Nucleic acid binder design. Structure first.
Ligand code: AGS
Ligand code: AGS
Ligand code: ADP
Ligand code: MG
Ligand code: MG
Lengths: 258, 258, 327, 340, 159, 338, 254
DNA sequence: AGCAGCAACAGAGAATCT
């Protein structure tokens, strides 16, 4: 148990301040608690991380609920914080003094005596930002591939239209169950059109042979469209099993054409 | 195979000093009549082209041409072991993954041997040299270096203008303007200081000073520099070697083109 | 020659007797310099009040005509960092004068744009070297200065120029130039100045250029209003009356014809109507709340562009709905 | 030389082809060009700050003034033009602008002093000063205050509020007025006659009416109408309907349908008609402006309704001026004005 | 910690005794009031008043060293009627040359450090003082924006 | 497929005859051509019409284009990497492929292309709505200084985020979405060329009624449902809807079914899963609001508040950067309304 | 007009090397009896003052004085084209916007010509030199440079103390203290190595080492350096030229 | 999504020694 020297010279972990922002002590004046919390938020200088902590915690916190309006009032503050944070890169940081007020709105609105347990937290945003960057880089690479092959397609394809319209249909076409098609000629014609589509988008079939002793090196599409299109974890498993048989047939047809 | 022994490692070191900095990748090719090498910078405004005949070597054997590409930086990093007076032998098999540089002192004593990793570069040697250029001139290379070093300070562009019996270098920028005017002349007291000029048509071209600065390095290989200019093609700056030459082809600025 | 400088630069005060408007601070500074006890000065005030002119005339009176050599004048145009402080300001404070014997003067003009680290390094330079040099900090906003630096200097607030001093300077300019000015024109000129001598000098030069004559005539209100593009009180009150009493379509037509006959701007009309309605003795403050809120919203929207007709109709409707609560 | 310039101007769009070269070509901004012409004979040009709506002729006015001052020879040696396409941070303002201001004026030639006044100062203009950060702007304060003897500063902007108060006080404020039909009909008729633009009686005045104080957009619309009338080759005159068709103006009948759907109709019918109307590409700003004109001009609505319609249109325009979705804003506006 | 009134008064009395200065009780009271626990600022204001007028009187101290900026702002925000706050802002702050940025920023500080009113109304007043700040930082800083901020604060206080 | 059957000239266009005639009029004299801005609904065919107009201004080689790469250095040595679509007569830039570094690429690349120069080289700025205000301000003077060597053809879907100076500096051309009849006629030619089997023609009309004027979406959906019916469309072939539209519909069902914080958590989770898969938040908000208004359980009082909150939070999202921070707020406000 | 031709571009290059780094702006003025130049650093503790008489030039013509100000950095940037042996001619009209530097080789061959943009500086030449200084001393400039280079390492302040027949330089800082003591002496084996000292009053002044370091550059212009110190004014360090001199006036640390 | 202030590393130039 070592903490005395910490109370002596160290501040309040931003996590401890977030858990304190959702706690009300019934034995102290609400105004004194508010000024103590304001001083702790100001001394920390990291108002953004405290607010992101408050944003991740508030849905799991117990708060006397009438119609979940409290959340509607806080979306307007959070929007005010985002405007203020954008303006900090444009203007000399005079606006930084108001950044400590937004976390204190959580204490006013959601602070309750019921919140005795510390809720642990994480950083979904850094993971979402890195994932959004990776997905944007994949999409930027597909858009470059279209620009090099499809001379006209590139003029009609916006980044948003590519993500929401073109890629989901392209993936649905590749993942379609060819085993239901009894007509061999029609199966061959569809496979020739799909090989032409894979060529127009420059989608390479790579045999991932990274399988420890298990006799099925899964075929993967490069770039992996699957990571951009497949939002639903249930659909990922169904699509992976169907694709494995289709991709082997498509690879054999690409090799035949080569 | 590649088997070329330079009497003095110094010659090869100065040659590579010429490719140095201005290019990253160099493609060498040895053959029955010698060694050639070409390197193009990323913006594609400068081509460095080398030719070393069989007679420039103390020993040269080639029964089967070999083409090899490499990173210039890696090569120069290794090119300071020649003691200048050391003997240097370039060695490679017919299907190399590396190039061996072997430096040896006269006596059996110190043998420094390197095995440099090669890069795969699509063989595509350019043959952009012209039959006739609008104007041709040669002058001491140290003089050309001074002319370039003067003007460089004033602008990122140095203009070369040629009229009958007149060569004029000009730079004009922020702090002001400068010019160096030279006239053809035969010095019998030693003709290596003469300034020759053959003009079939007046020329007036602009080059990016950063590139001319890269080019002046050739002074260390030859006393004189030949400059061939045309309004139809990249300019040629040439530094002769005993059996060979180092050439720099530089595209004139269109208005903004190095 | 001085005949090529603009009127703002040509008529820059060179002595402390040519700085009008500021009397309580000018006399105190003169006494400080005559008696010898000149502390670290902090001239805080709006632009165009005469802080730079005051400190320049002060340094001239202190060191003579060689002011440009015995004084270290730094401003926002020059690089003012922490290393710049450490080297230049400390070497200036620690050393002595090369032209005469006496204390030194460091004029940190527009020091509200300095870095916090620079002020933190300078606050101990002011406290250490205080027997051979002095510090003068000029500022428009007192919030950009650290409290430690703000507490080491004696603060002088430059009030906006009053009517008497600005009229005295106008008379001095009318004496220096072959120019005549109407009394009502002079009053209108003082009205559109807000205590800014720069604006007065600029528009005076501009209306002298507008005269088109060899200056045998006078400058009336029409010249000033047409040159500065400012609305007249007559058209202002006419638009306000047509908005308050007349019909919606008639009010729209009146506003359109007023803003299109003289090319007036909607923002100037907004500010004028705000200034006029400030004297209106009104009922329950709800009307004032609605009026101020809607007018400020429309002004902030105009500050970013949009449809001038839509914004004019918005002003009309806002004023009307605000006054509908007064019944 | 000059003939190449004439041909390049003749093969140039009408916006750049008819750019004012002298201070007399300015048709409506007379108050500013009068002072600029008077100071042309004197030598006391002050620091200037041009501000106003876009397309009023600020850049053209300052270019014509600099030309009439310095001649086509000193036009390229005594001018420092900095636009928004260049870097204008604190570093640039402190190094380049201050080095150019501290430098001395270039010597005029013998042919310059014989035809042009050749003032003893140079001109540094900063076009589109709205993008300049306030610290880089405050850095210009003493730069323009101390070196005023050798250089003069000309700021150009659209929103005068984006420039700090000290800079606005140091410079003489020149407000450029909107170019409506009254003060620009002469220039529009001159442009039409110089290009043989055969139009009807109320076309040009209508064009500026669509321009809403913007001569550049009016000249562009006139050029488009002339091209569309020359392609047909019928030899007839341009009509106001043909002009308002290519100007993005919603036809009167389509607007009357919107008025009927707003007056009579529920949320579902209004939403369906808005979804159908958004299929045909129309700018929401123009629709809001036309609805405002119709509602404020029509003498058939109560004043209490008029205050509310004006405030709602103001809010809708303020929201649309921020890059929002036109469909959502238009639907919200129509729904809010339907509840009235 | 801050220096209480007694300590600064004792130090100023010692300095006056050591310097033989003519003073009065109200003048020293005004000096200590304008010092706000700042001994260095107190001695500086005392020396400046002595060298500028000779007699340390409240009139001289107030004419040379303007009253504390935050106190007038607090009295403006704590006004009960809109017209009183508007007149205070016009005469005390705007007619004396105080910039709008200083007024709004001093305003924010006063509110944050306010204790007369509750927490929620203080947060709403701070929110309103913020929009006016954003508009003034965008260059729209005028008297109308501060008037609208005061009107919104009063509307919040208007239940 | 959309790309296999696309017009390459002005005489190959099959809808908006008045727009084709206006384009022919504008391309009659190509040298005295001002800058152009094509605006209208997304999927109308403005990017095809701009290339068709270039095919009239220049030779047929305008479609033979190549993709190159260009590197840029900001303050950091970070080498902003941008690919360029270039042609021997024009070039295409899409500043929507990066963050706040649009101004650098715009100014530097356009100055290089203008200094190097029928007689001019056309420039196609794709998705001009993503251009930041600073990049637009930088392009403002570049549009006017170099008007004899560089002509801009900016393709956008809404002139709302485009500043007024840029709007004035170029002609504005509106591209209205094609009528359902023209879409049906185009789908007819496509299915007769692709050899599809239609039991009844009216299904094509329904495709138009499911596309809302979008031809790009119409042809893609027709081809997607032609693969499910095995190249033979019947009288009751199901309509193939994208996955994100189904997710948004399920989200609205969850909204109208349950209004609580526990459901707000899963709503935030769905929003995160949608945003993480390259789906813009403005389109998410638009579709969510439009499909929430379609809920017949709500009344006019609920729909008015919903559209007001959607406009407010659309302004918030256009003024903010953390899109989920506004999306969750709008969802919470809608939950509080219902 | 300005028309001054230096036999060797090298002399001018070394002179400018002296202003280099320690000052940014220099104000030159040519006239009937030669050229003078003055430059003051930003902190105003150092004044660099030059005088070149008519005889230092190979050709000098002046029928009308011209004053011109310029950025030294710009000047030095251009001052490495002299080949040292090149001939240098400074040229300017009576109302210049630029200064022309013309370097030419003996033969017509190569001609490097520059046109440097001028800055407008309010003409205000200082005349701070004293009639008599408390003490005066001269010694080889290379010796003075070593003395300065030694002590500089120890402190940012170097004290010079003079008493009868004794000159003492001292530095004292963090790592310790150092001192260099020299005594007057006449060396007939070559008097350019002698150390003279004339003391009317003992002196003891402190200078910022950074400035003394700037000053030692003058060694390249003269074999000896003259140092004049006073408790009433800036110290004078002087480097004589053939017909002329380069002077550095440095204010003592208070 | 500036700047700045920084500090550290690398390259070039000058001086000294062999
Ligand atoms: N009190 C005054 N008396 C006479 N002229 C004045 C006065 N105040 C300002 N002026 C004029 O206005 C010009 C500018 O004055 P400045 O002192 O530069 O303004 P300022 O008070 O320093 O405010 P800044 O520089 O924007 S922070 C002077 O050159 C005078 O022509
Ligand atoms: N007063 C005018 N008289 C004649 N032509 C004008 C006038 N104002 C604008 N124009 C025309 O419009 C063109 C554009 O002029 P500009 O000066 O660039 O407009 P602007 O005020 O600069 O708008 P910006 O740059 O968006 S703020 C000119 O080349 C003229 O063809
Ligand atoms: N004139 C035309 N006739 C038939 N189909 C067309 C025509 N113009 C475009 N299309 C097709 O209609 C769809 C329009 O979507 P898209 O091309 O993305 O629009 P945009 O050109 O605006 O980007 C595409 O399938 C396109 O090939
Ligand atoms: Mg000032
Ligand atoms: Mg402009």
């Amino acid at each position: 148990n070592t903490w005395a020297s910490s109370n002596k010279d160290s501040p309040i972990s931003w996590f401890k301040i977030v858990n304190q922002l959702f706690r009300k002590d019934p034995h102290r004046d609400i105004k004194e608690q508010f000024y103590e919390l304001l001083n702790q938020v100001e001394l920390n200088g990291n108002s953004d991380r405290i607010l992101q902590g408050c944003f991740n915690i508030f849905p799991y916190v117990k708060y006397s609920d009438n119609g979940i309006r409290k959340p509607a009032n806080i979306s307007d503050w959070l929007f005010f914080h985002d405007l203020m944070y954008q303006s900090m890169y444009a203007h000399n940081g005079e606006l930084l003094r108001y950044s400590a007020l937004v976390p204190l709105v959580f204490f006013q609105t959601f602070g309750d005596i019921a919140n005795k347990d510390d809720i642990r937290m994480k950083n979904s945003e850094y993971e979402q930002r890195e994932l959004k960057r990776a997905n944007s880089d994949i999409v930027s690479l597909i858009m470059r591939h279209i620009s090099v092959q499809s001379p006209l397609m590139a003029s009609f394809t916006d980044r948003k239209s590519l993500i929401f319209e073109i890629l989901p249909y392209l993936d649905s076409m590749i993942s379609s169950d060819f085993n239901k098609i009894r007509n061999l000629k029609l199966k061959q014609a569809i496979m020739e059109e799909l090989v032409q589509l894979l060529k127009s988008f420059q989608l390479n079939l790579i045999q991932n042979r990274s399988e420890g002793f298990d006799v099925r090196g899964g075929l993967t599409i490069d770039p992996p469209i699957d990571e951009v299109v497949l939002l639903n974890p249930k659909h990922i498993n169904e699509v992976q099993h169907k694709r494995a048989n289709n991709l082997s047939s498509l690879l054999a047809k690409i090799e035949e054409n080569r | 195979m590649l088997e070329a022994k330079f009497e003095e490692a110094s010659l090869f070191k100065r040659i590579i000093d010429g490719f140095k900095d201005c290019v990253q990748l160099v493609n060498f090719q040895c053959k029955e009549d010698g060694i050639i090498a070409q390197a193009v910078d990323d913006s594609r405004v400068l081509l460095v082209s080398l030719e070393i005949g069989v007679e420039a070597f103390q020993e040269y054997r080639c029964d089967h041409p070999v083409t090899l590409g490499m990173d210039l930086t890696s090569l120069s990093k290794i090119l300071r072991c020649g003691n200048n007076t050391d003997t240097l032998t370039l060695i490679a098999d017919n299907t190399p993954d590396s190039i061996i540089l072997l430096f040896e002192d006269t006596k059996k004593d110190r043998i420094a041997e390197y095995s440099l990793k090669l890069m795969d570069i699509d063989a595509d040697f350019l043959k952009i040299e012209e039959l006739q250029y609008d104007s041709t001139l040669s002058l001491p290379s140290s003089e050309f270096s001074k002319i370039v070093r003067d003007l460089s300070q004033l602008s990122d562009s140095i203009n070369i203008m040629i009229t009958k019996e007149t060569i004029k270098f000009v730079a004009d920028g922020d702090i002001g303007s400068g010019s160096v005017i030279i006239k053809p002349f035969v010095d019998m007291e030693h003709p290596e200081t003469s300034i020759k000029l053959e003009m079939d048509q007046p020329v007036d071209l602009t080059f990016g000073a950063k590139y001319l600065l890269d080019i002046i390095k050739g002074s260390s290989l030859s006393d004189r520099v030949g400059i061939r200019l045309s309004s139809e093609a990249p300019a040629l700056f040439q530094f002769d070697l005993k059996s060979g030459f180092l050439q720099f082809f530089l595209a004139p600025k269109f208005n903004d083109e190095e | 020659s001085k005949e090529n400088l603009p009127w703002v630069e040509k008529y820059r005060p060179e002595t402390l007797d040519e700085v009008y408007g500021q009397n309580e601070v000018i006399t105190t500074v003169r006494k400080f310099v005559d008696e010898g006890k000149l502390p670290h000065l902090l001239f805080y005030g709006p632009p165009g009040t005469g802080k730079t002119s005051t400190i320049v005339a002060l340094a001239r009176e202190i060191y003579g005509k060689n002011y440009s050599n015995m004084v270290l004048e730094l401003n926002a145009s020059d690089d003012r960092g922490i290393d710049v402080v450490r080297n230049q300001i400390k070497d200036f404070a620690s050393t002595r004068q090369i032209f005469s014997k006496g204390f030194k003067l460091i004029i940190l003009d527009e020091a509200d744009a300095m870095t916090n680290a620079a002020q933190n390094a300078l606050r101990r330079v002011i406290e250490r070297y205080t027997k051979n040099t002095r510090f003068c900090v000029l500022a428009n906003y007192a919030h950009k200065l650290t409290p430690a630096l703000l507490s080491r200097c004696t603060r002088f607030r430059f009030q906006p120029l009053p009517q008497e001093a600005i009229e005295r300077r106008i008379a001095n300019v009318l004496v220096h130039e072959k120019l005549k000015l109407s009394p009502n024109a002079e009053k209108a000129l003082i009205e559109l100045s807000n205590g800014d001598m720069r604006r007065v000098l600029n528009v005076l030069q501009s209306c002298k250029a507008t005269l088109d004559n060899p200056d045998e005539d006078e400058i009336s209100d029409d010249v000033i209003y047409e040159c500065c593009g400012a609305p007249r009180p007559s058209d202002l009150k006419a638009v306000l009356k047509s908005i308050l009493e007349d019909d919606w379509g008639t009010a729209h037509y009146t506003l359109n014809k007023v803003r299109s006959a003289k090319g007036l701007a909607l923002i100037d009309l907004i500010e004028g109507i705000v200034k006029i309605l400030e004297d209106y003795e009104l009922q329950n403050e709800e009307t004032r709340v609605h009026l101020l809120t809607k007018l400020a919203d429309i002004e902030y929207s105009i500050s970013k562009g949009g449809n001038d007709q839509i914004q004019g109709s918005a002003v009309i409707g806002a004023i009307k709905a605000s006054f509908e609560n007064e019944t | 030389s000059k003939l190449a310039a004439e041909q390049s101007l003749a093969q140039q769009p009408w916006v750049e082809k008819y750019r004012p070269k002298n201070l007399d070509e300015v048709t409506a901004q007379d108050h500013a060009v009068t002072v600029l012409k008077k100071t042309l004979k004197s030598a006391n040009l002050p620091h200037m700050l041009f501000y106003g709506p876009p397309g009023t002729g600020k850049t053209s006015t300052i270019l014509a003034l600099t030309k009439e001052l310095y001649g086509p020879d000193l036009m390229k040696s005594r001018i420092l033009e900095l636009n928004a396409s260049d870097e204008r941070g604190i570093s640039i303002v402190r190094e380049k602008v201050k080095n150019f201001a501290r430098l001395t004026v270039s010597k005029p030639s013998k042919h310059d002093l014989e035809n042009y006044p050749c003032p003893p100062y140079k001109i540094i203009i900063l076009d589109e000063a709205d993008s300049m950060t306030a610290d880089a702007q405050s850095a210009l304060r003493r730069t323009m205050e101390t070196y005023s003897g050798v250089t003069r500063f000309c700021l150009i902007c659209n929103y005068v509020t984006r420039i700090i108060d000290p800079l606005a006080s140091r410079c003489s404020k020149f407000r450029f007025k909107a170019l409506d039909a009254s003060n620009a009909i002469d220039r529009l008729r001159f442009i039409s006659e110089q290009e043989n633009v055969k139009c009807d009686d109320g076309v040009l005045e209508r064009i500026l009416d669509i321009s809403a104080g913007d001569l550049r957009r009016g000249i562009t619309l006139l050029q488009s109408a002339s091209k569309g009338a020359q392609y047909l080759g019928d030899g007839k005159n341009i009509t106001s309907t043909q002009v308002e068709e290519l100007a993005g103006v919603v036809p009167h009948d389509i607007l009357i349908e919107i008025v009927e759907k707003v007056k009579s109709g529920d949320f579902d019918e209004i939403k369906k008609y808005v979804n159908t109307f958004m299929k045909s590409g129309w700018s929401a700003a123009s629709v809001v402006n036309q609805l405002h004109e119709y509602y404020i001009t029509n003498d058939n609505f109560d004043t209490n309704f008029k205050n509310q319609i004006s405030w709602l249109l103001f809010t809708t325009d303020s929201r649309l001026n921020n890059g929002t979705n036109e469909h959502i804003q238009l639907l919200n506006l129509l729904v809010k004005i339907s509840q009235l | 910690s801050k220096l209480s009134d007694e300590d600064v008064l004792k130090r100023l009395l010692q300095i006056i005794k050591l310097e033989d200065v003519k003073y009065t009780n109200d003048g020293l009271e005004a000096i200590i009031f304008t010092a706000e626990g700042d001994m260095r600022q107190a001695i500086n204001n005392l020396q400046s008043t002595v060298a500028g007028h000779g007699l340390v009187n409240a009139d001289n101290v107030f004419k040379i060293v303007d009253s504390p900026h935050p106190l007038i702002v607090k009295k403006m925000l704590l006004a009960s009627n809109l017209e009183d706050s508007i007149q205070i802002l016009r005469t005390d702050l705007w007619k004396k040359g105080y910039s709008s940025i200083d007024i709004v920023t001093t305003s924010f500080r006063v509110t944050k450090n306010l204790a007369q009113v509750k927490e929620s109304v203080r947060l709403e007043m701070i929110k309103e003082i913020g929009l006016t700040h954003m508009r003034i930082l965008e260059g729209v800083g005028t008297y109308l924006q501060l008037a609208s901020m005061l009107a919104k604060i009063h509307k919040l206080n208007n239940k | 497929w959309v790309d296999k059957y696309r017009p390459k000239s002005l005489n190959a266009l099959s809808h908006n005859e008045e727009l084709t005639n206006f384009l022919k009029s504008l391309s009659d004299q190509p040298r005295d051509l001002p800058h152009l801005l094509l605006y209208g609904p997304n999927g109308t065919g403005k990017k095809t019409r701009c290339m068709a107009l270039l095919e009239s201004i220049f030779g047929p080689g305008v479609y033979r284009l190549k993709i190159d790469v260009r590197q840029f250095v900001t303050a950091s040595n970070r080498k902003l990497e941008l690919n360029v679509v270039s042609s021997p007569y024009h070039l295409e830039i899409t500043p929507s492929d990066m963050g706040n570094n649009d101004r650098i690429v715009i100014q530097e690349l356009l100055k290089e292309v203008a200094q190097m120069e029928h007689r001019y080289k056309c420039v196609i700025i794709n998705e001009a709505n993503s251009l930041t205000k600073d990049a637009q301000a930088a392009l403002r003077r570049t549009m006017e200084k170099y008007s004899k060597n560089i002509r801009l053809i900016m393709v956008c879907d809404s002139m709302s985020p485009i500043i007024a100076p840029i709007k004035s500096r170029c002609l504005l051309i509106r591209c209205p979405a094609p009528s359902d009849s023209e879409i049906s006629t185009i789908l007819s030619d496509v299915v007769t060329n692709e050899r599809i089997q239609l039991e009844t023609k009216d299904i094509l009309k329904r495709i138009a009624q499911a596309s809302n004027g979008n031809l790009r979406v119409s042809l893609l959906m027709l081809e997607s449902m032609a693969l499910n019916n095995e190249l033979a469309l019947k009288s009751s072939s199901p309509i193939i809807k994208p996955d994100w539209i189904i997710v948004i519909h399920k989200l609205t069902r969850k909204i109208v079914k349950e209004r609580s914080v526990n459901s707000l958590i899963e709503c935030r989770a769905v929003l995160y899963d949608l945003l993480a898969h390259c789906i813009p938040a403005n389109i998410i908000l638009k579709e969510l609001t439009f499909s929430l208004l379609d809920v017949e359980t709500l009344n006019t009082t609920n729909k008015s508040s919903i559209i007001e909150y959607s406009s407010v939070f659309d302004e918030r999202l256009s003024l903010g950067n953390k899109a989920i921070f506004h999306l969750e707020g709008f969802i919470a406000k809608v939950m509080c309304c219902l």
